[PDB]
């Protein structure tokens, strides 16, 4: 049934703001890519403006586009 993303076809060498960092398109540091609990887009903590210096401890997190 793959690929999981039709925008990049899961090409790991291609940037993708749909399935990877929604800001930079980068796939690096998945452990630092927060997933929005509304839109399910991913955001590197360091791409956010302002940047977060660590992954939040709260269970839920909503990206800048969802509040």
């Amino acid at each position: 049934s793959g690929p999981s993303c039709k925008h990049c076809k899961d090409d790991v060498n291609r940037l993708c703001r749909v399935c990877a960092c929604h800001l930079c398109g980068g796939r690096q540091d998945p452990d630092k890519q927060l997933m929005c609990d509304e839109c399910d887009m991913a955001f590197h903590i360091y791409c956010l403006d302002p940047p977060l210096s660590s992954v939040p401890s709260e269970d839920e997190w909503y990206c800048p586009e969802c509040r």
Partner: peptide
């Protein structure tokens, strides 16, 4: 919070 890693 969820991350790509835990998702």
């Amino acid at each position: 919070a969820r991350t790509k890693q835990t998702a």
